[PDB]
């Protein structure tokens, strides 16, 4: 019994990229034109792309022309679909289907299909950060040496810039490399050490700029 199995589905942010593969069992793809098809939420099927034998011809649905690429590997029997600049309406179940029949001809129907892999494109291509204060500890040393900062959490994508007091405060500042959380959103911290004697006289505000979402936040960091 002929079988096809897709790999690579998942969640993608709008604008993102995702690549699918297709593997087979109990036949060789070399003699077959291979195809990608998707079922959209409304229930209808949409032809996405086709690649002929020998890769002589590659054809694409108008909706994906220029954004998707199909490739084949006759030696190990794989088919690939590259999806770039993904759009919400690309959300669908993607199937890899073989063009074929009992005796091959120049134009056969899709006689074998994979079970399908789910591809979901979220509408948000960007997300603005939440900003939380890193308050200086009340138990600082009398005379100087206090640390404070800002926590920049749950944004996407990189990068964000951080300045302190609109650039007036630069000495002692450290803005750490962002880290990617299991949620798929980035987070980082920016801290600065200042004289303990200055809390209460100098106001400290971190300026966070997330250009990809054109979002800006100013956060006043005060004791306690």
């Amino acid at each position: 019994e002929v079988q096809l199995v897709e790999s690579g589905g998942g969640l993608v942010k709008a604008g993102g990229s995702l690549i699918l593969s297709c593997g087979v069992s109990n036949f060789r793809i070399s003699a077959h034109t291979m195809n990608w098809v998707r079922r959209v939420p409304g229930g209808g099927l949409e032809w996405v792309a086709s690649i002929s034998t020998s890769s002589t011809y590659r054809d694409y649905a108008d909706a994906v022309k220029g954004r998707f690429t199909v490739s084949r590997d006759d030696l190990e029997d794989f088919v690939y679909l590259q999806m770039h600049k993904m759009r919400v309406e690309d959300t669908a179940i993607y199937y890899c289907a073989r063009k074929g029949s009992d005796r091959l001809s120049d134009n056969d129907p899709f006689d074998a299909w994979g079970p399908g892999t789910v591809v979901t494109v979220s509408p948000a291509s960007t997300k603005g950060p939440s900003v939380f204060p890193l308050a200086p500890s009340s138990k600082s040393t009398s005379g100087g040496t206090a640390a404070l900062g800002c926590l920049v959490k749950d944004y996407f994508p990189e990068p964000v810039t951080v300045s302190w007091n609109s650039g007036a405060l630069t000495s002692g500042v450290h803005t750490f490399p962002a880290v990617l959380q299991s949620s798929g959103l980035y987070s980082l911290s920016s801290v600065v050490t200042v004289p303990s004697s200055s809390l209460g006289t100098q106001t400290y505000i971190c300026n966070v700029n997330h250009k990809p979402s054109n979002t800006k936040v100013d956060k006043k960091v005060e004791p306690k």
């Binding site: 098809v37 099927l45 054809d59 134009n107 129907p109 899709f110 994979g114």
Partner: protein, 213 residues
């Protein structure tokens, strides 16, 4: 560049019936037309190709006819296994186009939904999230609309839903919609309502609750 128009979108019938699904092409495609069966969450299955040739193993109750621009899929003696979606397809050497698809279901009388709304549980609220659920129970036919209103402001982009398959015993459908908000947003508002539109109602039904009560 060939648009395939399939008709109807939904076909309600009974076991034993002979039904006809029509497929029309915006221009002549000779007999380069195939029919597929697909069940929910399953892969398409090829039934008929070259407009009228049955695949080996496909029962004889399936037949196809037509050429040029008008094609017909016939199922003579509908069985339970046949309730499913059917897809027509123009296939060319290196491309294809599909019709919108036709869902074949068991016919019964119209039935209005029973509507229920469930506030978030206190336990869930404690963890920072608020899921509100609206239940549309045992309605027919399948087309129904759910509208969430929060303090009479229409919601969008923050709800999901899923629908059951036609019930084995009364052939009805049911639908569940979940509105999800953060604890912060949930407590900014008081009245949560889900408004249901369905051919069985004389007008839309609303179920609501006030937060806290």
């Amino acid at each position: 560049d060939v648009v395939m128009t399939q008709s109807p979108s939904t076909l309600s019938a009974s076991v034993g019936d002979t039904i006809t699904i029509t497929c029309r092409a915006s221009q002549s495609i000779e007999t380069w037309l195939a029919w597929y069966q697909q069940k929910p969450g399953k892969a398409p299955k090829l039934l008929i190709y070259k407009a009228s040739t049955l695949k080996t193993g496909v029962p004889s109750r399936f037949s196809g006819s037509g050429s040029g621009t008008e094609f017909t899929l016939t199922i003579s003696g509908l069985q339970f296994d046949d309730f499913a979606t059917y897809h027509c397809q123009h296939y060319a050497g290196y491309s294809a186009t599909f019709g919108q698809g036709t869902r074949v279901e068991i016919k019964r009388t119209v039935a209005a939904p029973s509507v229920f709304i469930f506030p978030p549980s206190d336990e869930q609220l404690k963890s920072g999230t608020a899921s509100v659920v609206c239940l549309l129970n045992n309605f027919y036919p399948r087309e129904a609309k759910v509208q969430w209103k929060v303090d009479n402001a229409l919601q969008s982009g923050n709800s999901q839903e899923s629908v059951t398959e036609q019930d084995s015993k009364d052939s009805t459908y049911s639908l569940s919609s979940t509105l999800t908000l953060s604890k912060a947003d949930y407590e900014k508002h008081k009245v949560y309502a889900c408004e249901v539109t369905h051919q069985g109602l004389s007008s839309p039904v609303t179920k609501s609750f006030n937060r806290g009560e």
